[PDB]
Amino acid sequence: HMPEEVHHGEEEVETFAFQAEIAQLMSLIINTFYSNKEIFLRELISNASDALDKIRYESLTDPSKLDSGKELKIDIIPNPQERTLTLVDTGIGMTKADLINNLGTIAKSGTKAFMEALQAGADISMIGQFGVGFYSAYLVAEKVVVITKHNDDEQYAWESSAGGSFTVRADHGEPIGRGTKVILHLKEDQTEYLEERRVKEVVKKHSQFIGYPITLYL
């Protein structure tokens, strides 16, 4: 009795190409010698703060939206043994449709405009003025995983190593309840961001007036 499941039904892991504009910005960022790479953390904290603002406001008109977690917070977890730096917020999260669209497609206009500004003399620290600061993660990471959970959808995992494509799959792993978890698989030359004195240094410098608590775990 050796049955064979020849058809699973749904495709478990889906692979898609970025819009060319996004892929080209990602290649620029992952390979640049720009020497102020710590700005990646400000950009991720800024995205977390925006997502936390969003669930905070929706919870005013609908307090049940906080059933998936009442505290609004940011946690930062360096992991030397896995060479990862993780940021987890309890913001509004993203549905599958918005996860694919926002990271894979809709960022095209911002990444294109940003590359044009860079060619004209702008600097990489301006990336957030184009609405695409997330991709500054590749200043320090060779691979980025985004786990996200929105009240209206199930938990999903996105990942890309900036080779032109990303994958999205349902995440049946540890529930995050609500929010977004960004896992940075760090470049070998960027492991200073696995150290607590360094991470705290960067948070104090760039994110000192963020309106949510930021906790560091070691």
Q: Which one-letter DSSP state was computed for residue 87?
A: E
Q: Going by DSSP bridges, is the β-strand pair 74-79/84-89 parallel, antiparallel, or unpaired?
A: antiparallel
Site for ligand KU3 contains 180 (CB under 6 A): yes
Write down the least CB distance from residue 87 to ligand KU3, Å. 6
Write down the least CB distance from residue 65 to ligand KU3, Å. 13
Q: Rounded to 5 degrees, what angle do the CA atoms 36, 42, 48 make?
A: 155
- Residue 151 marked as a ligand binder: no
Residue 47 neighbours by CB distance under 10 Å: 20
Stretch that binds ligand KU3, among 12-20, 27-35, 50-58, 200-208 (CB under 6 A): 50-58
Applying the rule CB under 6 A, the residues between 147 and 176 that interact with ligand KU3 are 148
Q: Which one-letter DSSP state was computed for residue 190?
A: G
Applying the rule CB under 6 A, the residues between 71 and 90 that interact with ligand KU3 are 87, 89
Provide the residue type at 104 as one letter. G
Write down the least CB distance from residue 149 to ligand KU3, Å. 9
Count of residues interacting with ligand KU3 (CB under 6 A): 17
| Residue 145 DSSP SS3 | strand
Site for ligand KU3 contains 97 (CB under 6 A): no
Q: Which two tokens stand for residue 206?
A: 């760039």
**Contact call for residues 77 and 217 (beta carbons, < 8 A):** yes
> Residues annotated as binding site for ATP?
47, 89, 108, 134
Chain contacts with ligand KU3 (rule: CB under 6 A): 44, 47-48, 50-51, 54, 87, 89, 91-94, 134, 146, 148, 180, 182
